[PDB]
């Protein structure tokens, strides 16, 4: 009878093992034991992104944001979802919001968020070039 924290830790181990459907299911079990922890949802959202299940990832980002409106990763993963959906202006807005929140929270992700912003703006520009 594992605790919610034990199930999150098992999911994280499976994530290290690149067993993403199994990790996502573990995070679901953690949610069953405590559905009020935003990190369980952003962890699962990242699994769904790795699994190319952007619709399921977006839903988890929304669940996380309801619980933690300041979540950097919820905004970042949401922007990644929107990039795949070709909602470029929304994706850029969420990536800039993740950048702002990470700065406010003194979080260090190297150059990950600016790199994602550059990817998003290039894809937006590429979408313009593909139509003329």
């Amino acid at each position: 009878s594992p605790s919610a924290q034990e199930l999150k830790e098992q999911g994280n181990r499976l994530f290290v093992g690149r067993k993403y459907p199994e990790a996502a299911a573990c995070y679901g079990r953690a949610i069953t034991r405590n559905p009020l922890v935003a990190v369980y949802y952003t962890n699962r959202a990242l699994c769904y992104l790795k699994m190319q299940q952007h619709e399921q990832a977006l839903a988890d980002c929304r669940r996380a944001l309801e619980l933690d409106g300041q979540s950097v990763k919820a905004h970042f993963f949401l922007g990644q979802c929107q990039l795949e959906m070709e909602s470029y202006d929304e994706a850029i807005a969420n990536l800039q919001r993740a950048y702002s929140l990470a700065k406010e929270q003194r979080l260090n992700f190297g150059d990950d968020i600016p790199s994602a912003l550059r990817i998003a703006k290039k894809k937006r520009w590429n979408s313009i070039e593909e139509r003329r």
Partner: peptide, 6 residues
């Protein structure tokens, strides 16, 4: 760094 689980 950001594409990691917490």
């Amino acid at each position: 760094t950001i594409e990691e689980v917490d």
